[PDB]
Design a protein around this ligand. Structure first.
Ligand code: SF4
Ligand SMILES: [Cl-]
Ligand SMILES: [Cl-]
Ligand SMILES: [N+]
Length: 304
């Protein structure tokens, strides 16, 4: 025929030529999810980064996720397709906040959400995601923990563990999940009265309290078998992921306008350019990476 390769076919060829794997988060654009080799939540992506056979990881996700992959694979090439694929919440936490909390509470473990810089993780005893924060905090040998950046996840963890949570920084939150309100709950239950509500713990507490399930995006997928219709209180591309996994169920976005700008910095074109030009190489200074790795490895040890 007269036709050549499209972007998809160019990516498939370059993935072979580079001996690469494409890891994608659940919030990636559908056409990006459709070319990824592995799709998952933050915890699943971290765990998958410990069994990489490929030489090159193309990370279709935000900065903190790609850096976590690099911390776990210091001697592989990790590429982020855009350096503007960033998490607003992760960048709210600075080392100075951690040091001030550690001064007040020297015996409190420092528990950092994976939404954090590698520099911040160098001061963590253990990392967590929304999938394992409760389990990890419950197991830590202290009735008080320093925890951040997300104050809404912190609220959920405090409620479920009964432990005292010292927030770092004071007001960390995700603007995407803050778009969900009680009015969205009322509208969803009116429009879809037979649906159950799956709600991310980055949503505000009063919205969390309306959930049928509170879960990470990975837990939403794991627990979707519990009902046939769901309203999805997280970033709207999760609806595509759930529909692909369970075509027989019904999924509805809680808000179509719940979009993560950083996630959508990743495009098919820049994934192609990432493989073609071997960019942008993610690097983490060795001293930071080794300390961060200790905290991430401990997380993986404490939650299977
Ligand atoms: S959805 Fe929110 S917390 Fe998750 S990557 Fe985007 S800004 Fe960060
Ligand atoms: Cl692999
Ligand atoms: Cl199924
Ligand atoms: N103890």
């Amino acid at each position: 025929g007269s036709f050549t390769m499209d972007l998809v076919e160019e990516i498939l060829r370059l993935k072979e030529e580079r001996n690469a794997i494409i890891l994608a988060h659940n919030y990636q654009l559908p056409e990006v999810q459709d070319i990824a080799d592995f799709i998952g939540d933050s915890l699943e992506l971290a765990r998958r980064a410990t069994r990489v056979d490929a030489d090159v990881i193309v990370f279709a996700g935000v900065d903190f996720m790609a850096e976590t992959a690099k911390i776990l694979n210091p001697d592989k090439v990790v590429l982020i397709p855009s350096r503007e694929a960033t998490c607003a919440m992760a960048n709210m936490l600075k080392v100075e906040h951690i040091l001030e909390a550690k001064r007040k509470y020297p015996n409190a473990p420092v528990v950092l959400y994976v939404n954090s810089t590698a520099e911040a993780k160098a001061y963590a005893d253990v990392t967590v995601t929304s999938a394992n924060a409760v389990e990890v905090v419950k197991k830590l040998d202290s009735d008080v923990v320093i925890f951040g950046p997300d104050k809404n996840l912190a609220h959920y963890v405090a409620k479920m563990t009964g432990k005292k949570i010292i927030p770092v920084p004071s007001k960390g939150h995700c603007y995407v999940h803050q778009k969900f309100t009680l009015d969205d709950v009322e509208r969803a239950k009116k429009l879809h009265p037979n649906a159950k509500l799956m709600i991310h713990p980055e949503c505000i507490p009063e919205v969390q309290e309306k959930a049928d399930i509170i879960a990470s995006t990975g837990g939403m997928i794991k627990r979707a078998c519990e009902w046939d219709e769901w309203v999805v209180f997280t970033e709207r591309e999760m609806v595509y992921r759930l529909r692909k996994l369970y075509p027989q169920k019904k999924f509805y976005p809680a808000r179509e306008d719940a979009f993560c700008i950083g996630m959508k910095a990743i495009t098919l074109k820049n994934i192609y350019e990432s493989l073609k030009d071997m960019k942008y190489k993610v690097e983490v200074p060795e001293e930071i990476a080794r300390k961060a790795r200790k905290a991430i490895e401990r997380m993986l040890e404490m939650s299977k």
